[PDB]
Design an enzyme around this catalytic site. Structure first.
Site, PDB file in Angstrom:
ATOM      1  N   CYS A  98       0.775  -1.214   0.000  1.00  0.00           N
ATOM      2  CA  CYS A  98       0.000   0.000   0.000  1.00  0.00           C
ATOM      3  C   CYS A  98       0.825   1.292   0.000  1.00  0.00           C
ATOM      4  CB  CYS A  98      -0.962  -0.070   1.182  1.00  0.00           C
ATOM      5  SG  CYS A  98      -2.011  -1.611   1.193  1.00  0.00           S
ATOM      6  N   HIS A 306      -8.631   3.850  -3.776  1.00  0.00           N
ATOM      7  CA  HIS A 306      -7.276   3.465  -3.339  1.00  0.00           C
ATOM      8  C   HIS A 306      -6.573   2.568  -4.343  1.00  0.00           C
ATOM      9  CE1 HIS A 306      -3.948   2.403  -0.894  1.00  0.00           C
ATOM     10  NE2 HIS A 306      -4.436   1.293  -0.367  1.00  0.00           N
ATOM     11  N   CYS A 334      -1.398   2.492   6.488  1.00  0.00           N
ATOM     12  CA  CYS A 334      -1.212   1.159   7.039  1.00  0.00           C
ATOM     13  C   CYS A 334      -0.714   0.387   5.828  1.00  0.00           C
ATOM     14  CB  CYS A 334      -2.557   0.583   7.503  1.00  0.00           C
ATOM     15  SG  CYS A 334      -3.820   0.447   6.166  1.00  0.00           S
ATOM     16  N   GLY A 336      -0.171  -3.383   3.815  1.00  0.00           N
ATOM     17  CA  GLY A 336      -0.627  -4.751   3.644  1.00  0.00           C
ATOM     18  C   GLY A 336      -0.237  -5.863   4.602  1.00  0.00           C
TER      19      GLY A 336
END
Lengths: 348, 343
Positions: A98, A306, A334, A336
């Site tokens: 992410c 996202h 945050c 993955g």
């Protein structure tokens, strides 16, 4: 810290495309390679004259990507190659899940810092549409929603983002940072097709696709070339977090980058905390004690979407338009398989 | 440069596995996650008391990979998770193609230099056996020229080839590749720990390198095999991708002040004999210095592992205070090169 030294990592340009809708969206019939080629062609025209004059002045292209085979390195490098960036320029594919796009930034931040390069391009792409297509403890965790599961406040939260995103959308607020990506039918896409009006609170983030770029340079080299400067990268920090409760990332990354720089929560004007899911965003904001007023000012992931890869660098383009000269803002998310990242920036 | 400051990025450990053979060799019934899990359980054992104690002192695991979905970011994080490396330790998957394992080292170096971390693990992994199964413009299509073809772009090659196998078996046999190779245990009980290829190349292999700031090493009472000096990358025409080492070597030498004749060992990856010959020649290198214990023509080139492999190999071929380089041409048109010092 607000003192501009000649050895600062400076942001010269930070742009992103309109984030389309996964599966249904404007981008559905297109992959990261066309998205990238195109965004690049746009981004380059938006480049100061000495640069576009000699593109081989960009000495590195870090491109974050989560879903392509090998993180898209062959296709992304071909794409750069089609958009005029000379062969003389190395390219690196990265996938930190992410945060990938924010890590493309830390990658170039460090190279420049260390002298490996002077000027370097950070990218982030994701075509979730065309790419989502591809058990003994600990390792048994690894790669989302259920780690979130691990509702009034969450819907409340989902709507305000949706409202903040719609206001901003309608008030023309993202018209600066977004670039028009021509679609192969003839269309052209310059609006985030995710935020919608009248979202209120009802019982019943977003799978999208997008690109985003960032052009860093060392202040010294900038002055010499007289290149506009939007702000400067200050630091970056990642942390490992229990994979089952991934979302908790920001609640550990933020204090980390803070301690390493000396700032405190209350020294931050704006927080671009990625909302993978509302439950986690809220938890993060309330554990740290962040002013919810200072959080995701123009809408978040819940409303905007996202596009995995592209996100970390999308937030940069964004946080720069929300900031006012001499303001400090953080970008966190945050990660993955249980991580947390967070970079700090300043306007100028 | 041969002065040692605490600010140095120091190699604390660097082992590799035996490079299996593609499609048929030892590892053919396994993928990266298994090669990693195992390589790590081994490596960690061959880790100094203090680290093994903590293992959380490691603050980053960059790990090259070229052919897995998203360069194997999830699978390999789990592997690290499973081989006892804590959740606390972030992880990064990189893909620079042929140099992935080296750039993964570049990655760790920089973070350590820039104070971002103290100690970090660099890796290379590949299972060409399992994963080898994963525009219309006059410029990007060159990123569609098959490697071998770019090599099209013989005697001397065959002679260069011969030596590779000769030096490799001679050295394999003389037990030269022993301290570096770790024993990868297999499902059917058969431990693997000897290079298949050299018996006078598509392959699968792993590789690990544990950098740390010098100051930090001396603090935790850690062994020190050598040092990371520099690294440099340079794009190159994709149609002649191979010529990459010819450009990255000058560049990294230049960045350092060193010259060709200041280099002892030249671990130039043999992706092809036609290619490697050129770099050698163009650069004016003494062959006695190039690929002493043989190359990939014999040993194999497990794409993302190689970069991290060459470091293991080179660190044994070099004697206390010797300088050597690791270059390789890179896939879509690039070239990398690093410089190490023994101690």
């Amino acid at each position: 810290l607000l003192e501009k030294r000649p050895e600062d990592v400076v942001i010269v340009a930070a742009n992103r495309s309109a984030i389309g809708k996964g599966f249904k969206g404007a981008f559905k019939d297109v992959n990261t390679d066309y998205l990238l080629y195109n965004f690049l062609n746009e981004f380059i025209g938006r480049f100061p004259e000495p640069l576009r004059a000699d593109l081989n002045l960009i000495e590195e292209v870090a491109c974050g990507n989560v879903l392509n085979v090998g993180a898209g390195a062959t296709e992304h490098r071909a794409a750069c190659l089609a958009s005029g960036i000379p062969y003389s320029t190395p390219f690196v594919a990265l996938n930190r899940q992410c945060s990938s796009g924010l890590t493309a930034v830390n990658d170039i931040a460090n190279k420049i810092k260390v002298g490996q390069i002077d000027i370097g391009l950070a990218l982030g792409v994701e075509s979730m549409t065309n790419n989502y297509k591809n058990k003994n403890r600990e390792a048994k965790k690894c790669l989302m929603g259920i780690t979130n599961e691990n509702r009034k406040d969450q819907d409340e939260f989902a709507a305000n983002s949706y409202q903040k995103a719609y206001k901003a959308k309608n008030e023309g607020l993202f018209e600066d940072e977004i670039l028009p990506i021509k679609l192969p039918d003839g269309s052209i896409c310059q609006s985030d097709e995710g935020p919608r009006p009248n979202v209120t609170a009802e019982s019943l983030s977003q799978v999208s696709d997008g690109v985003a770029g960032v052009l860093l340079a060392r202040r010294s080299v900038a002055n010499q070339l007289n290149l506009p400067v939007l702000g400067r990268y200050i630091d970056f920090q990642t942390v490992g977090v229990p994979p089952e409760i991934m979302g908790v990332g920001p609640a550990y990354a933020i204090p980390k980058v803070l301690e390493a720089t000396g700032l405190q929560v209350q020294d931050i004007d704006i927080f671009e905390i990625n909302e993978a899911f509302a439950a986690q965003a809220l938890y993060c904001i309330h554990k740290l004690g962040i002013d919810l007023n200072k959080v995701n000012p123009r809408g978040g992931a819940i409303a905007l979407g996202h596009p995995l890869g592209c996100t970390g660098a999308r937030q940069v383009a964004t946080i720069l338009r929300e900031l006012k000269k001499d303001q400090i803002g953080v970008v966190s998310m945050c990660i993955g398989t249980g991580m947390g990242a967070a970079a700090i920036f300043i306007k100028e």
